[PDB]
Design a protein around this ligand. Sequence first.
Ligand SMILES: O=c1ccn([C@@H]2O[C@H](COP(=O)(O)OP(=O)(O)O)[C@@H](O)[C@H]2O)c(=O)[nH]1
Length: 435
Amino acid sequence: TTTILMLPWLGYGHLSAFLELAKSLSRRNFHIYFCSTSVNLDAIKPKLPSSFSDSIQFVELHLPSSPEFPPHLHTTNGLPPTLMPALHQAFSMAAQHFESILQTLAPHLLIYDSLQPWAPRVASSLKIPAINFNTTGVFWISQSLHPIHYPHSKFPFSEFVLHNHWKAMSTERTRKRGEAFLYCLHASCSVILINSFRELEGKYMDYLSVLLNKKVVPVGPLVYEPGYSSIKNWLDKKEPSSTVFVSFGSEYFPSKEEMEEIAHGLEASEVNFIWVVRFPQGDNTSGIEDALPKGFLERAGERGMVVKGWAPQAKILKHWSTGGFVSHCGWNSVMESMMFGVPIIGVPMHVDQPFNAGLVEEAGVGVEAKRDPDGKIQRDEVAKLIKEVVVEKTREDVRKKAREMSEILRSKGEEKFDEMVAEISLLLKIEHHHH
Ligand SMILES: O=c1ccn([C@@H]2O[C@H](COP(=O)(O)OP(=O)(O)O)[C@@H](O)[C@H]2O)c(=O)[nH]1
C-alpha cells in the first residue's frame, strides 16, 4: 500500500545497488516502482528473483533517441567515454517524461541518485517527498567536501594521500558538476541514504553529516548474491585460494599501455587468473589478441583465462579457488569482495576509485598497487602484490583481516535497514499532515 518509486543513475553499478535496496524495502511491505531506461531494465531484470515481481515493478523512462544515439546506448554500461556528455544531457531531458510517470503512478516517496538534480525538483513540484540514495561510499565525498570548508587544514580521521596523478586531474565546469552532485545530497528530505557500514566508514559518515548539516543513514553493504559452467570447470582444476579475478567494472576500458602493465604483472606473478576484457559498444574492429601483449596468453597457458565482455563476478569471487581480486575498486566490487572475504589488489582508475583503494588499504582487507611518479600502473607492483597476497601468502595479516571483515558483514541481517524504514515512516507521517 505504501509505494516508492526508485530512480537510479543509468550505470549498472547504480542500478545494482538500487535493486538490492528495492528488495530490502519489498521485504518491509513497500511496493516499488523501479524506473530506468529499457536497456538498463533488461540488464538488471535477471537479478530480480521472480518472488519479488508482484512487489517490485519495472517502469520504462524514455530518453531522447536518434539513429546516432539509439536506446541500446542509454546506459554507461560499455558506453564509449566520449558519449558520456550526451548521456548526461539526454537524462536531464527525460525530466518531462519522469514528471508524467510520477503524476500517473502517484508514489508516496521517490528515492533518487546523486546524478539527477532535476529529480527532487520534479518530486517537490508534485508534493512527493524525495530521499537521495548514494550507491557509492562516503570517504571520497567527505574528502572532496572537506577542502571547501577547511582549505588550509589536513583531512582529519585519515592518513590517506591522493597520488598527484589524480590531484592533477574548465574550472567553472568542474565546480558546477560538484555543485549539482552536492545539491542532490543537500536537497534530500531529512536524511541521505548511503551504501556503506559504520565498521568501515563510521567516522567519515559522521564528518559528512556535520559538514552537510544532514542526517546520513547507512543501508550497506548491498551485495547481490545469485557462462559460469565453463569457468567453474576451469576453477575446479586449480588449488584453493590460488586464482585472481581481474575486472575494471562496466564503465571503464583500460588503455593498451595499462593492459600491458597488468598483463606483465600477472605473468611475472605466476598466478592463476580469470580476466574480463571488454570493448565499447559498436567496436567490432577490436579483439582480445589485439588488446593484450603478443604471446601473453600462450605464455600463461593453463594459468590464464580471458573472458570476453562480461563474467559472473559474484560466483567467481565465491569460488574456493579464488584467493585475490585485481579490481579497479568500484564500490560495488569492493563491497562484494569484502562480503566474500576475497583480498583486493587495488588498480584504481578514476573518480571515487583511488579513495576506495585507500580505504581498502586503511582497513587492512586489501592492498593498493601504487602508480609511478608519472602516473602509470607498474607491472612490478602488480606482480609483487599478487605474489605476496595470493601466490606466497606472505601477507597473512591481510588474509586474516579480509576473513574477519567477511564474518562481520555476514553477521548482519534485516536490522541494517531499520533506521531507513523509521526515517521513511516519520517523513511520510509529517508530509501527510502538511498536505
Ligand atoms: O564482468 C563483470 C564486471 C562487473 N560486474 C558487476 O558489475 C558491478 C560493477 O559495479 P562497480 O561499482 O564495482 O563498478 P562500475 O562498473 O560502476 O565502475 C558489480 O556489481 C560487479 O559485480 C559483473 O557482474 N561482471
